[PDB]
A paper describes a structure:
The [name] polyprotein, composed of MA, CA, [name], NC, SP2, and P6 domains, is the sole viral component needed for the assembly and release of an immature virus particle, which is accomplished by the oligomerization of [name] into a lattice structure at the plasma membrane. Cryo-electron tomography (cryo-ET) data has revealed that the immature [name] lattice forms a spherical cage of interconnected hexamers where the CA protein plays a critical role in stabilizing the spherical hexameric lattice before the viral protease cleaves the [name] polyprotein into its individual subunits and maturation occurs. CA is composed of two domains, the N-terminal domain (NTD) and the C-terminal domain (CTD). By contrast, the immature CA hexamer is stabilized by both CTD-CTD and NTD-NTD interactions and adopts a more extended conformation with a six-helix bundle at the base of the CA-[name] domains, and the immature lattice is stabilized by NTD-NTD interactions that mediate the inter-hexamer contacts.
Numbering used by the authors:
A (entry chain A), B (entry chain C), C (entry chain Q), D (entry chain B), E (entry chain P): 9 to 240
Write the structure that this text describes.
Amino acid sequence: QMVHQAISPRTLNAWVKVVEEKAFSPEVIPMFSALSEGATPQDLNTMLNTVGGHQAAMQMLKETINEEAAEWDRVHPVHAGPIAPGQMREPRGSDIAGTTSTLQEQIGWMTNNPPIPVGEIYKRWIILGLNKIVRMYSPTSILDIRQGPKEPFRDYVDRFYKTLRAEQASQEVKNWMTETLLVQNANPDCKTILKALGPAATLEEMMTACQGVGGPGHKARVLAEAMSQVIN
Amino acid sequence: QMVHQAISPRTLNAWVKVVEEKAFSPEVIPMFSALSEGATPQDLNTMLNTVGGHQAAMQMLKETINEEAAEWDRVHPVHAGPIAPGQMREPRGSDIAGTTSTLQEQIGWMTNNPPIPVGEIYKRWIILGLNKIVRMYSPTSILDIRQGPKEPFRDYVDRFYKTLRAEQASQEVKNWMTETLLVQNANPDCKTILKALGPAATLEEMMTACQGVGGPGHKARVLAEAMSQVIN
Amino acid sequence: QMVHQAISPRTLNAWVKVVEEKAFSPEVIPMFSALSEGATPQDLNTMLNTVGGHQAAMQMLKETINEEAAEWDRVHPVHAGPIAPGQMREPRGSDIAGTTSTLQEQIGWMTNNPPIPVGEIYKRWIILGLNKIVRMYSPTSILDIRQGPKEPFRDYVDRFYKTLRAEQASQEVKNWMTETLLVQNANPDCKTILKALGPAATLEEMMTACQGVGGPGHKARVLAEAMSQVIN
Amino acid sequence: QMVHQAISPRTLNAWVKVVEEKAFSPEVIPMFSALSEGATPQDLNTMLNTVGGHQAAMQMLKETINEEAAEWDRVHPVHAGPIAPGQMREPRGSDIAGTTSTLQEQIGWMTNNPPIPVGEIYKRWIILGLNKIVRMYSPTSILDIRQGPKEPFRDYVDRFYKTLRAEQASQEVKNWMTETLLVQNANPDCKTILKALGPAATLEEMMTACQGVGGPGHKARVLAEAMSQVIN
Amino acid sequence: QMVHQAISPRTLNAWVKVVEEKAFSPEVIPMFSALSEGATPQDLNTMLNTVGGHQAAMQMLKETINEEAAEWDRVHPVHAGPIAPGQMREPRGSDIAGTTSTLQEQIGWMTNNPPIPVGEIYKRWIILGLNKIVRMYSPTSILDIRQGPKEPFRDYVDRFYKTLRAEQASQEVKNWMTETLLVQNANPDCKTILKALGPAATLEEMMTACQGVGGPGHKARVLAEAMSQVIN
Ligand SMILES: CC(C)(C#Cc1ccc(-c2ccc(Cl)c3c(NS(C)(=O)=O)nn(CC(F)(F)F)c23)c([C@H](Cc2cc(F)cc(F)c2)NC(=O)Cn2nc(C(F)(F)F)c3c2C(F)(F)[C@@H]2C[C@H]32)n1)S(C)(=O)=O
Ligand SMILES: CC(C)(C#Cc1ccc(-c2ccc(Cl)c3c(NS(C)(=O)=O)nn(CC(F)(F)F)c23)c([C@H](Cc2cc(F)cc(F)c2)NC(=O)Cn2nc(C(F)(F)F)c3c2C(F)(F)[C@@H]2C[C@H]32)n1)S(C)(=O)=O
Ligand SMILES: CC(C)(C#Cc1ccc(-c2ccc(Cl)c3c(NS(C)(=O)=O)nn(CC(F)(F)F)c23)c([C@H](Cc2cc(F)cc(F)c2)NC(=O)Cn2nc(C(F)(F)F)c3c2C(F)(F)[C@@H]2C[C@H]32)n1)S(C)(=O)=O
Ligand SMILES: CC(C)(C#Cc1ccc(-c2ccc(Cl)c3c(NS(C)(=O)=O)nn(CC(F)(F)F)c23)c([C@H](Cc2cc(F)cc(F)c2)NC(=O)Cn2nc(C(F)(F)F)c3c2C(F)(F)[C@@H]2C[C@H]32)n1)S(C)(=O)=O
Ligand SMILES: CC(C)(C#Cc1ccc(-c2ccc(Cl)c3c(NS(C)(=O)=O)nn(CC(F)(F)F)c23)c([C@H](Cc2cc(F)cc(F)c2)NC(=O)Cn2nc(C(F)(F)F)c3c2C(F)(F)[C@@H]2C[C@H]32)n1)S(C)(=O)=O
Ligand SMILES: C=C(C)[C@@H]1CC[C@]2(C(=O)O)CC[C@]3(C)[C@H](CC[C@@H]4[C@@]5(C)CC[C@H](OC(=O)CC(C)(C)C(=O)O)C(C)(C)[C@@H]5CC[C@]43C)[C@@H]12
Ligand SMILES: O=P(O)(O)O[C@H]1[C@H](OP(=O)(O)O)[C@H](OP(=O)(O)O)[C@H](OP(=O)(O)O)[C@@H](OP(=O)(O)O)[C@H]1OP(=O)(O)O
């Protein structure tokens, strides 16, 4: 037969925009519940594959799906023997998840009498994964990258640029983030030097200027400055 | 047959109260999805017709529904004509939306074997529309009606009263809104005159007092006052 | 037959965690609808019985379910006559709610041809109840217990400890709550006395110290001190 | 038959990441050319539908595809006469674009003898559209929203918030953008007032303070201050 | 047959409330012993699945159950051959715990002649696990999160918020904990700066103010302050 509730172009685009705009806020759960309703496991897998970024969250979701597939296998014993020509093989957990089943097999299960709603079972597994992601997963934010009090400036710059590469933004916005946040979120010892450097300093000049922060000479110099302030 | 999941009086009232209390915040999407499950397209249309105000949002929803009906028609080719006497005509997008189908026809599709869940397909279309509304539609608010720096006071009053007529509130709250926000949200040039006029001033008196703001006489008078302050 | 959408261990645990973490915030409505889909009324009742605390909310939910069951009974007239041996009895509202139906009967209704999705009907009833709870139910909070201006300190302490017993917290957190909030949220008249007592004062000492607040002696003493300030 | 070059989950995810990371820089053209080679028009349409945002760009692509389909229809004259039972209908432009053709028909055209590579023809059409997008389409940027010299502060705030809603960023990043760019990109006349307000000022306070900029009172006041400097 | 001592709704709710109120104080052991008496392994598994939080404790309980099942398998040799039609398979350790057995099999074992009380055997295994939890498991407490003498403020804040997410409390109580405990439980070096910041400081301002504690400039400054106190 055919699946009447196969996802339309606008449904898939709406799911993509939901993920892009809300990330994994709780609102993702009702949206996925409504957009994916009635769809085959193949359509749900398409929706899950359209998620860009958030690799850790998607790995969490995959682990949850595997656990639910194992639970399905535990609750459904394997039947050994020759299947009737009219009948078809009973779904397994991987068949529900669509890893070992074709679209035709999923449609056959969904439209059989009695029907096995493999799409809705898979949808509940995905919802469990999404709930786990919403509770536990925190996406990396370029706004959260601050230099540690004893962290070398080079290591902080490496962390900043790694997070910026992972950041969801336009390239112009990422350039503006580099121009604003990097010096702003440095630790005070490095920030003093960076401000003394001036606004026109390049990244290499900034990195050379802070290369000694925490070394013997810089420590002695700041200690001597503080002691001179005290004596005066 | 009969639809076991037809909307109850409490279900319809809950949907009405959801729309009235939350407008089109994201919470409207789960509630609708929960409140309309297993209902016919007729019940869904009844739920949609109970939305008071937000006419622009309802128009956006209608456009989304029409687009989804067109997609359904594209995916489902029409038949040649030999309809089986026992069988019924296959639904079109308009039939899914309930514009060209009766309640009996929708029930027949829903309870047929194999079943066509016309209600659930229509629900998915309505959810797509509601998502578009939540993302893109902003209801007019009496709170953000402010007089422009060069806007005539009469035009501002007309805008304020149009928004107030569109506002969801009781008549007493609307009167209090008129007494409070109209003078508060005027521009400084008109606001000074209104303050000098006194609380007892009526709408006609305020409008007459502010009729000359921005004209040559008022501009000359304010410029002369500023010049006199400068000279002194 | 067999129900393929029976709640798994992780589904039940997710529902328990949702109720514990979110109480009855609106997020409870989508989560329930997602976790409970396809389940029998028995699984729905299991989830409902897993709710610890919020007894008034659960009474509201029960009242809503009874009203929906009455609506179902009104809509479905009871038919007199012996049921066919192949057929089963038509469900009543109590049967959908699972009070008067066994799991076997629920599964038979859900997997019959034509099917009666008693699980989905009951789910919508529970959603109506949950929506009513979210709208109208506010859980008691230990943070909200504050001594009235003329309330005896003993009555305030009784209310505080009752609310603390109802509070969802660990014993250590409850002890810290007692150490912090009880004196903090006392009225000024008792609060000056409690501060004068000192940090080491026990509950009995605090209750004895404030036992006279509002009595003729305390009123006369505070009036005398105020008059001393005035005539100073 | 079957299509061996159907897009894999990783191929689709790579396309999604390309669009999210590069927007429509020229690099999109090689990536799309390489990721979509040998795919059916259905897979191509899926990839096109996973593009979030850039609605004007997608409309441009749709117009280019429609014009290429019209060119195909011009070049290939529709032949009148029943098709051979072994043969299949020749594809039209809409068939290559996938609007009026099913996946089975596309596979039949691609795997026929002689083959009609509808996937590759559609790929070239999409590449033409993408080239037009890369040359002529500029995405909106929140960094580009600056208040005009005579623009009311209300209108500038409206434009800023519309562009921010359209911006591809996390909610925290959008909040930081509101905190940073709105006052920064205001015109000098509003900017001096906003600075005088202080950092703690809310949006409504900022919007009330600038409500009179450009009005007769503000014009007179600034002219008076300038004349005070001159005649000093 | 049927299990006469299947857990009632009130039994399950009482178990949930026991775990919520008491966590894993020794009182859990008698309560579980009394609530679960006579129940099938399926019912006990339900009770264990209703435990929210304490995931480490539940993992310990699962390990104890697995060890007891292994001991059962060691003591009960596997019998190979054709089971009598009137007889059922002898239970294994996994069958006692209900992982590889169905409710029907458990009821058959429990009601057979001679009976195998699989529920009570499983109950003793669970009691052993609960005893191990009571002796060894210590739940995380937000009250126990204190900043180390050399710990960066950002790391301490991250630990605090992780523990707060795991804490059993209402959201309002968690907000109160954030407003009270975080500054209170910081180390003295950070607490001095935080107190100098003021009561209205946000989390970002607090993190910025302590970003340099332990860095060279801060160390020099505090050493200079101490030396100045000594010289004076
Ligand atoms: C052809 C088509 C119709 C199809 C299909 C199709 C078929 C099956 C599956 C699949 C489903 C369930 C499981 Cl449980 C496993 C599995 N279990 S396993 C042995 O442990 O790995 N493997 N698969 C791969 C399988 F089946 F091919 F083997 C799956 C997918 C998933 C959908 C999915 C994506 C996701 F993110 C998280 C999920 F839980 C499920 N997509 C992938 O898995 C590829 N992926 N994975 C991960 C990650 F690791 F981060 F989670 C990532 C991707 C990514 F999308 F690139 C993206 C960056 C993230 N799609 S179409 C048009 O969509 O292309
Ligand atoms: C008999 C009965 C059970 C029925 C039915 C019934 C049947 C069909 C439809 C309908 C459904 C879908 C489409 Cl797609 C079209 C269509 N497509 S079209 C060619 O472009 O216009 N037309 N219809 C009219 C049709 F079918 F009659 F032709 C429809 C409605 C809609 C329900 C609906 C309301 C809505 F807000 C938005 C929707 F998307 C759908 N209600 C209307 O449409 C009337 N409406 N419209 C608009 C607006 F334009 F602002 F959105 C407004 C109304 C309003 F309610 F007054 C309210 C102020 C807003 N109800 S009942 C309840 O009466 O007793
Ligand atoms: C055996 C099993 C499979 C089962 C079942 C099972 C079967 C039926 C029902 C039931 C369902 C619907 C109605 Cl409408 C009535 C009814 N209508 S009536 C004549 O007016 O009272 N009675 N019942 C009892 C019936 F059926 F026995 F008669 C019900 C329950 C409910 C589920 C439920 C819980 C709830 F909170 C609110 C609900 F709306 C429904 N649970 C109870 O009712 C016991 N309960 N009640 C209340 C309260 F009063 F606060 F709401 C409280 C409990 C509590 F859980 F302790 C908790 C503190 C709160 N469970 S299992 C594994 O789960 O144990
Ligand atoms: C079921 C499935 C296999 C399929 C399919 C499927 C089938 C066909 C088409 C399609 C292809 C070519 C043309 Cl030439 C037209 C057409 N020509 S016409 C009469 O002038 O409009 N109509 N269609 C709709 C048709 F065919 F239904 F009629 C098409 C699509 C396009 C793919 C596409 C996307 C795109 F962005 C630009 C394109 F050029 C083509 N997707 C849509 O069209 C929906 N869309 N449109 C636009 C816009 F208008 F902005 F461009 C937008 C969308 C959006 F994705 F939401 C996104 C925000 C942007 N997908 S699956 C798993 O992928 O869902
Ligand atoms: C359908 C139904 C009747 C049933 C059943 C049902 C059937 C079996 C089991 C089970 C029992 C014994 C073992 Cl010895 C194993 C096993 N041994 S193994 C190969 O090493 O992992 N696996 N199982 C899963 C099995 F059998 F399905 F494979 C089990 C469970 C357990 C009950 C249980 C919970 C628990 F906390 C600790 C236990 F010791 C036992 N529930 C789970 O296990 C799922 N779980 N696990 C863990 C953790 F890992 F943290 F401990 C957590 C959960 C959680 F509940 F989510 C919660 C957060 C914590 N329930 S119902 C109405 O209740 O849903
Ligand atoms: C004779 C006098 C009493 C005094 C004594 C000497 C004097 C002085 O020192 O005070 C020299 C300066 C002047 C001439 C004043 C008179 C007033 C004028 C005036 C206020 C006149 C109104 C004019 O305004 C416009 O044209 C309106 C405007 C918005 C610019 C438009 O139309 O585009 C401007 C240009 C703003 C001038 C500035 C110069 C001065 C101060 C004189
Ligand atoms: O629009 P504004 O900037 O607020 O000022 C305008 C405008 O001056 P601008 O050139 O700065 O825009 C007019 O144009 P100019 O003559 O100065 O070039 C001017 O005179 P005209 O209208 O005769 O051209 C006069 O306009 P008005 O006659 O209405 O006073 C004036 O004041 P307004 O703001 O009130 O328009």
